[PDB]
Amino acid sequence: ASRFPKFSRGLSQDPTTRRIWFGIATAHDFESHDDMTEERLYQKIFASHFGQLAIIFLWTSGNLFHVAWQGNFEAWGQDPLHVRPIAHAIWDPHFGQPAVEAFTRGGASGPVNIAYSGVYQWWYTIGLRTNQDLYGGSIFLLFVSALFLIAGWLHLQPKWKPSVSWFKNAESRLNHHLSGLFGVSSLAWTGHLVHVAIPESRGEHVRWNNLLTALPHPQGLGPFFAGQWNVYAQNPDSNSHLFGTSEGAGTAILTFLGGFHPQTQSLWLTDMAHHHLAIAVIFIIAGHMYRTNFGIGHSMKEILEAHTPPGGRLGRGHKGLYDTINNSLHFQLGLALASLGVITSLVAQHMYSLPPYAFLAQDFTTQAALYTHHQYIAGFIMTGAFAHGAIFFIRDYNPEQNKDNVLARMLEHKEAIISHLSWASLFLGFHTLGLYVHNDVMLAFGTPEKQILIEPVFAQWIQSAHGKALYGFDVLLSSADSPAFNAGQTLWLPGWLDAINNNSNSLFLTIGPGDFLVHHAIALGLHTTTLILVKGALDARGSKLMPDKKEFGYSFPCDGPGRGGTCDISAWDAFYLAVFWMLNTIGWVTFYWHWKHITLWQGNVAQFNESSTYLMGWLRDYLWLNSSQLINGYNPFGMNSLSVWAWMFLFGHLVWATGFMFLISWRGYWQELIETLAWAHERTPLANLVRWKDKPVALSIVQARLVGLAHFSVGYIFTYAAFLIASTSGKFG
Amino acid sequence: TPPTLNADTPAPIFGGSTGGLLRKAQVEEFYVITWESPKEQIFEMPTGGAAIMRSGPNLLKLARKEQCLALGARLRTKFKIQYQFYRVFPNGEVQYLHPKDGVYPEKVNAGRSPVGVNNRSIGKNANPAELKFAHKQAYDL
Amino acid sequence: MTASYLPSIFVPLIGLVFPAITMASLFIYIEQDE
Amino acid sequence: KYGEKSVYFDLGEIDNTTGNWDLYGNDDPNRYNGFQNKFFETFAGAFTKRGLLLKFLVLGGATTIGYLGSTSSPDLLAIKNGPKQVPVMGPRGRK
Amino acid sequence: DVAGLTPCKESKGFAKREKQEIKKLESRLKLYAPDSAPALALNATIEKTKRRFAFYGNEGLLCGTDGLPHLIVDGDQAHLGEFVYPGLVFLYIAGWIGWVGRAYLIDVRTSKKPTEKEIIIDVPLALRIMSKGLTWPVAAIGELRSGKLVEKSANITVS
Amino acid sequence: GYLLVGPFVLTGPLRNSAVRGEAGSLAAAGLVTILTMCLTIYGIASFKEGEPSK
Amino acid sequence: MTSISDSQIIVALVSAFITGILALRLGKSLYQ
Amino acid sequence: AHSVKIYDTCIGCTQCVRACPTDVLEMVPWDGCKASQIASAPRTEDCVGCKRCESACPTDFLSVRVYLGAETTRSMGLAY
Amino acid sequence: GPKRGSIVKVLRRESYWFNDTGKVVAVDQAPGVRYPVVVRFDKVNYAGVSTNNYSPDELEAA
Ligand code: CLA
Ligand code: CLA
Ligand SMILES: CC1=C(/C=C/C(C)=C/C=C/C(C)=C/C=C/C=C(C)/C=C/C=C(C)/C=C/C2=C(C)CCCC2(C)C)C(C)(C)CCC1
Numbered sequence A: 001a002s003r004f005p006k007f008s009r010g011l012s013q014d015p016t017t018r019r020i021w022f023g024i025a026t027a028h029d030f031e032s033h034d035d036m037t038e039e040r041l042y043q044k045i046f047a048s049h050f051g052q053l054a055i056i057f058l059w060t061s062g063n064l065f066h067v068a069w070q071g072n073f074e075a076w077g078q079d080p081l082h083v084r085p086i087a088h089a090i091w092d093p094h095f096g097q098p099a100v101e102a103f104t105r106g107g108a109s110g111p112v113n114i115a116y117s118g119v120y121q122w123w124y125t126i127g128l129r130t131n132q133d134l135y136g137g138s139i140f141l142l143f144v145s146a147l148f149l150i151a152g153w154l155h156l157q158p159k160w161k162p163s164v165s166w167f168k169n170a171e172s173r174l175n176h177h178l179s180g181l182f183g184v185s186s187l188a189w190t191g192h193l194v195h196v197a198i199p200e201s202r203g204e205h206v207r208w209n210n211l212l213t214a215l216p217h218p219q220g221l222g223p224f225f226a227g228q229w230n231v232y233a234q235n236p237d238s239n240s241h242l243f244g245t246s247e248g249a250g251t252a253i254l255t256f257l258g259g260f261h262p263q264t265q266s267l268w269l270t271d272m273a274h275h276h277l278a279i280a281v282i283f284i285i286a287g288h289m290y291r292t293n294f295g296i297g298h299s300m301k302e303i304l305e306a307h308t309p310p311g312g313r314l315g316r317g318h319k320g321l322y323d324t325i326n327n328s329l330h331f332q333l334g335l336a337l338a339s340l341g342v343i344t345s346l347v348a349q350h351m352y353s354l355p356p357y358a359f360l361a362q363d364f365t366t367q368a369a370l371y372t373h374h375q376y377i378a379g380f381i382m383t384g385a386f387a388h389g390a391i392f393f394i395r396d397y398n399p400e401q402n403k404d405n406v407l408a409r410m411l412e413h414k415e416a417i418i419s420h421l422s423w424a425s426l427f428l429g430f431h432t433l434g435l436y437v438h439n440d441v442m443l444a445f446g447t448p449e450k451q452i453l454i455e456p457v458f459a460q461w462i463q464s465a466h467g468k469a470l471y472g473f474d475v476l477l478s479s480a481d482s483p484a485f486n487a488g489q490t491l492w493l494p495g496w497l498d499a500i501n502n503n504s505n506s507l508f509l510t511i512g513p514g515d516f517l518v519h520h521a522i523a524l525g526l527h528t529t530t531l532i533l534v535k536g537a538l539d540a541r542g543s544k545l546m547p548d549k550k551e552f553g554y555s556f557p558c559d560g561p562g563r564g565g566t567c568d569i570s571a572w573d574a575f576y577l578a579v580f581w582m583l584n585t586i587g588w589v590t591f592y593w594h595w596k597h598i599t600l601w602q603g604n605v606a607q608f609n610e611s612s613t614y615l616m617g618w619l620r621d622y623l624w625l626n627s628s629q630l631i632n633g634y635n636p637f638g639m640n641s642l643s644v645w646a647w648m649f650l651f652g653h654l655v656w657a658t659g660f661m662f663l664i665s666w667r668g669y670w671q672e673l674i675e676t677l678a679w680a681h682e683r684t685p686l687a688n689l690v691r692w693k694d695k696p697v698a699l700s701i702v703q704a705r706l707v708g709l710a711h712f713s714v715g716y717i718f719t720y721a722a723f724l725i726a727s728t729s730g731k732f733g
Numbered sequence B: 001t002p003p004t005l006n007a008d009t010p011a012p013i014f015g016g017s018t019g020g021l022l023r024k025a026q027v028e029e030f031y032v033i034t035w036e037s038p039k040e041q042i043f044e045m046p047t048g049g050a051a052i053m054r055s056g057p058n059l060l061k062l063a064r065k066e067q068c069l070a071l072g073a074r075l076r077t078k079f080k081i082q083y084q085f086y087r088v089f090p091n092g093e094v095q096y097l098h099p100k101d102g103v104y105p106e107k108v109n110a111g112r113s114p115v116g117v118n119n120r121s122i123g124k125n126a127n128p129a130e131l132k133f134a135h136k137q138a139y140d141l
Numbered sequence C: 001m002t003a004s005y006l007p008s009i010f011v012p013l014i015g016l017v018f019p020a021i022t023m024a025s026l027f028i029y030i031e032q033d034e
Numbered sequence D: 001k002y003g004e005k006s007v008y009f010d011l012g013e014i015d016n017t018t019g020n021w022d023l024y025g026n027d028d029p030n031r032y033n034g035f036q037n038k039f040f041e042t043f044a045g046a047f048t049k050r051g052l053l054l055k056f057l058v059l060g061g062a063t064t065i066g067y068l069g070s071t072s073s074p075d076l077l078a079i080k081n082g083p084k085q086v087p088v089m090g091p092r093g094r095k
Numbered sequence E: 001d002v003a004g005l006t007p008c009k010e011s012k013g014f015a016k017r018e019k020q021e022i023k024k025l026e027s028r029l030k031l032y033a034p035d036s037a038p039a040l041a042l043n044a045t046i047e048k049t050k051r052r053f054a055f056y057g058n059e060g061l062l063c064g065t066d067g068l069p070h071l072i073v074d075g076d077q078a079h080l081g082e083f084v085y086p087g088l089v090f091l092y093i094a095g096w097i098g099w100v101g102r103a104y105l106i107d108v109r110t111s112k113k114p115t116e117k118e119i120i121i122d123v124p125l126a127l128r129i130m131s132k133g134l135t136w137p138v139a140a141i142g143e144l145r146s147g148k149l150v151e152k153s154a155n156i157t158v159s
Numbered sequence F: 001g002y003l004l005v006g007p008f009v010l011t012g013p014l015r016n017s018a019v020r021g022e023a024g025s026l027a028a029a030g031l032v033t034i035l036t037m038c039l040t041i042y043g044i045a046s047f048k049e050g051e052p053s054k
Numbered sequence G: 001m002t003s004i005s006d007s008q009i010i011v012a013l014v015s016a017f018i019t020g021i022l023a024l025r026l027g028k029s030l031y032q
Numbered sequence H: 001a002h003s004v005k006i007y008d009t010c011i012g013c014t015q016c017v018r019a020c021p022t023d024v025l026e027m028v029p030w031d032g033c034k035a036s037q038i039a040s041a042p043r044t045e046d047c048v049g050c051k052r053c054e055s056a057c058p059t060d061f062l063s064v065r066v067y068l069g070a071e072t073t074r075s076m077g078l079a080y
Numbered sequence I: 001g002p003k004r005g006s007i008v009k010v011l012r013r014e015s016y017w018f019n020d021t022g023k024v025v026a027v028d029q030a031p032g033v034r035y036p037v038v039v040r041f042d043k044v045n046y047a048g049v050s051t052n053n054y055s056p057d058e059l060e061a062a
């Protein structure tokens, strides 16, 4: 309390440098602070969430301002396919003149950075056209962040502090959040689309000054209240429409065309409008479900209690889970993180194949960057979901209240779960690695016709069920006699079939034996990471080796060398181990995506179709082949604009290597070395005049694991980001 | 038993080392171990090196309690020598520590009271969720 | 670049003056007894 | 360290016992000249106070860094000199 | 045919690959004496390549665009030899080895010192158990139905 | 301060220009300023107004 | 065709300073 | 400031006391075992956390348990 | 407690031999002994021992 860790006495009284490290590392864990009550915990969390919102909005405002100030948004808008967007300017005093010449891209007057976030396409699609629009948005977002800061400060005041019962009103919070935050927000977005952005793509200009007089439709709101909702879809945009101009432009606002806009190769705007309108209606209806102050609606506890199978196969069913979830913040955090990870993976998978932004899918580097970014985010989020679930088992789980319900019966057959997961992982690993090595041996001996190439007929059958007429399966949407084809042949199927039978886009790419092998390696990675995380979560409360782990908390180094040795015994260590597998799996996924799309964009898909069936093919035709321009960023003959990416590549290799030092070498060596260093310092003339305040010590065991994992992950991310950006920007194809 | 005092007894014959006392002894506690030898013998210093113990009383300054106890354990198991050690503070306060009541800790002695004993098995401890928002640790109960 | 001289002031500031002040303040704060 | 015999422990001399000595400390008061001291105590004595020294250091460093950065001539800094060659086109004709 | 795959005999690219391999082997052969051992070895390799290509073409394998055989494992009656038959043979062999190992473990469990027989194998008993593994599926189903295959009172940790 | 001047002038970004001496001297003065700041913060963190001496 | 005025930059900087003051107040409230 | 607890499954074999490198444990007269003695931990302020006592305890599960806590200049084992 | 030579099943939850059979060695008849039964097992635990003391209410007659 006296010293820096004001929230911890044990850390405050520590005389070593461990105090600073652990005060930093445990600052944002409010349940562990001294004299912490539930009410203070909830209010502090609520204010911190306000602060996070303010930070997010300031980040967006900064992007907008820097693009409006130093970017060529208007020049890019004039010629989207021939101008490189500008992220921010460069002012580095350490440059030399050749670098200043090399980084002057775009139409800029000085060195700049080319943007790969895709915000140009997103802002252009939603109606923003000039720099004044971006400036207005930046100022507005500054105001919004200020509003959230004021809100946090106010709702922390004694008069305005909410009570603990307010934070536990699940039905009312879910009712408002589901109705407003989802349905009304999507309804407002549909309003923006219809009222502003659709006219922009047809050569109109609608702003705040003429919003009240510019009709979205020639006969506005007449048919809507007359029941003639089909009037708004009469005249869609033509296939010869030019985005941003009135050439071949329709007047419909809610079409249901399906497919892609031919000029921009993205989804129609009116499709997106009807989509967000339907989503808004569904969410607003779904909000009016749970009971509140008006005496109608369902009650979530009664729903959980009623659902319980007779015959006792599930035990007591979902009984008692309401209080377990309401009183545990870690259970809620785990559920939210799992859902968010699934949703992020969905975003990544569904954005590369159905691009929503005009001019995207022609900026190859942006597409690759977006995919990799959100996929790595999803992986980290999933690992966090499992970690905070393990924290729930250790901290908030009460065995007596969850007597014989589903939650306890999960702990009941945990050995069966872990055993069958181990079997699945072993099976996938053995037979997949065996097939890869067998193919390697076959091609090494000069006989590539002896390799085991298995056709992925299930995924091909699914593709044919979608209407792809390449594999000759002739089922469902591929069959003209099917009821589904006849039912959909007028609403959405023309455009959808035209898009899915095109072999130039990324909508249901053609697949072969290599794709089969890679999806199987991905399945191996998923089941193995799940094995590690589930083993950590279920064995968190105790095992045969240490039956009282729940008394030692979530994170602790070990239990000593007794009983054979107990290194890496806590559930935190299972998190630590599973992070490596998560990184490896996401690496496999991104490697596969990037190589397939490189071959697609160069037009040479045969190289992937032939070289992906063996591992030497990967190592030779992906990495070594595509690292040429990257490693030639700077050489004894000068430097290119890829110099920064080459430097980042080497930087990532170096940081990743440095992480190994913390990962492999442990503490006692370093502690003794520091002891010798302290002796040396105390005995040196002109240096004894200076004394340390904190006694130097080596890092803790858990701290060493964390620092090694951090250096490792940073090196991983920076290396792959540099390689991806350079290998896709050197060619742009 | 009446705890013993300290006096001016000779130190063992040692030629010096870099493993001796540091500024911690100056600004914090340091430890002194005393023993009696029947003859001069060579023993290994806990700080590294070999020393000769005098015939009669001996006195040795050490930086940690573990060093004193390791040297005393070696003396007892190898030379059959009884020993004492104390704790010295910078202001001059002396604290007698190892044979607290004159009997070594591995021998049961009357007048000792249990400390930290729990009257249950280790499997009967409570759950961390039961003692939520309380300062207990489920092993202090 | 409406100003085009602002970076020449802001980048040195945020890069050198801000880290110095913040590190000095944090070092004083953590090296206390209160 | 009483020092009479092989005794090195003595509660009377605890600084000798703990080895708290000054190895090279010299306490001769006469080092410099009187007028040197007059001049240096007159001029260098202003910066003795430490809070004022901190404020002066921070303000002076900020001012110096800003002035040098914003007024440096192009012939010294390449970043202020700017590009002097025609820009290079991108791979697919993208500028 | 299936997934737009052509038969190997009908396909072009299979024959192209055969021609390329034979041409490479003959180019290597051009360096040696006609009756020397390297010539005989190279000729043997050439004949083996010809026989392999003929067998693959005549066995009824589908061929991809790149000219290499592909496998079908969805259960098709025309391609059972690709997956289903070797799978059944492997299942028989693996069940045999696993079943005889389990039987030997069970028989050794009731001994004066099971660990000694665990490291030093009782060869006669092992041979008897190994020979009795021909009809392992029948014995396995027998013990599954008789209730002597699974256990119910096993050691577990604190749930 | 006297010893610091040489390394900054002989080696540096402007060592081959016509203002090498001035640039090196300014760099040495800046280093002296940074070390003065370090000394000030160390003295603040180490000593209080009441402690006799160490 | 627009390029952002200098007075616009002045306004943005002043707004950012005010937002920073508000953030300082919120952080002080959280710490205490 | 580690905490050492003794549980009533102790048999009084005195191995933990002999294994302790800093004299934290000692034997105390007791009733409840054939040896009629139990271990005690009065000098827990001197415990370093080595867990030799736990390694020396013969019992299905340990009768002596060490719970690591706040670190001190004695717990950190610092000679400087 | 159980007689010498009995076969008993351990019911202590933190025991290494939970749900495993033992072999009663000796029972202490002193009034105040808390774990008087001595049981010997076949396999050693992680610490390498194969003998433990149990209360009469932590064993099963089979
Ligand atoms: C209608 C009223 C209403 C509204 C609008 C909100 C809104 C909010 N509440 Mg809330 N609340 C309400 C009533 C309401 N509440 C009531 C009645 C109670 C008491 C019973 C509470 C109690 C409460 C608590 C206790 C907390 C909140 C919090 C929050 C915020 C959540 C963080 C956030 O912004 O998520 C934004 C989420 C979305 C916009 C949903 C988007 C859907 C998915 C995720 C993405 C889909 C969009 C699309 C695909 C992507 C497009 C993006 C673009 C780049 C293309 C949010 C602003 C939390 C907070 O942060 O505090 C400040 C918090 O801790 N509320
Ligand atoms: C390849 C990665 C890598 C790197 C760079 C290091 C680095 C180091 N290891 Mg090491 N180590 C590694 C992997 C690595 N390890 C692995 C995998 C293991 C497991 C076997 C070990 C095991 C190990 C042991 C057992 C020992 C070391 C030691 C050392 C040190 C060597 C002496 C020294 O100071 O070097 C000086 C050189 C450097 C630190 C690198 C050059 C400096 C760079 C260029 C940056 C400097 C300027 C920088 C920009 C400052 C500005 C910062 C500011 C911008 C914030 C050094 C810290 C030894 C040690 O402690 O040294 C006495 C030692 O005993 N390591
Ligand atoms: C440990 C723990 C935890 C955690 C957990 C987790 C983390 C989990 C996860 C999980 C997951 C992560 C899951 C996922 C899932 C998913 C799913 C299950 C899906 C499904 C889908 C479907 C079914 C679909 C269908 C379809 C199709 C196919 C097509 C179209 C149509 C439709 C839609 C119908 C918690 C916190 C709880 C707490 C306690 C402990």
Ligand code: SF4
Binding pocket: H004, H019, H020, H021, H022, H023, H024, H025, H046, H047, H048, H049, H050, H051, H052, H053, H054, H066
């Ligand atoms: S952990 Fe070590 S110091 Fe502590 S009581 Fe056990 S043996 Fe003694």
